Design a protein around this ligand. Structure first.
Ligand code: A1H98
Length: 102
């Protein structure tokens, strides 16, 4: 039931207009400095893979992955960059859907 909500939240996030930086993993070989700064990478397709095989035992574990996506994005990207702008927008969206459910 809680994970039921997580499926919907993930679909809406995947379908959001500001989702474009977060649909596939950052390839550390293609981004200078990414591996040295981000130890716990996360993205929506990785969350989708885990959710599909029942790898989230609680909604809390889903929320940890979602915030990793946005925390990694704020750590590595400036607020003024297109990717930075997108992470701030998706965090507010996630925080809005998460609070009108949990
Ligand atoms: C640019 C080289 C590269 N392409 C990809 C694949 N795919 C990853 C996500 N993506 C982004 O634009 C994106 N999303 C985030 C969270 C970031 C960073 C650095 O935080 C970035 C910069 C590449 C689209 C492309 N991997 O490396």
């Amino acid at each position: 039931s809680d994970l039921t909500f997580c499926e919907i939240i993930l679909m809406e996030m995947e379908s959001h207009d500001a989702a474009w930086p977060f649909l596939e993993p950052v390839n550390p070989r293609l981004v200078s400095g990414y591996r040295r700064i981000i130890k716990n990478p996360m993205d929506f397709s990785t969350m989708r893979e885990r959710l599909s095989r029942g790898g989230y035992t609680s909604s809390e574990e889903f929320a940890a992955d979602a915030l990793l996506v946005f925390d990694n994005c704020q750590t590595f990207n400036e607020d003024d960059s297109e990717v930075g702008k997108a992470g701030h927008i998706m965090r507010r969206f996630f925080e809005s859907r998460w609070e009108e459910f949990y």
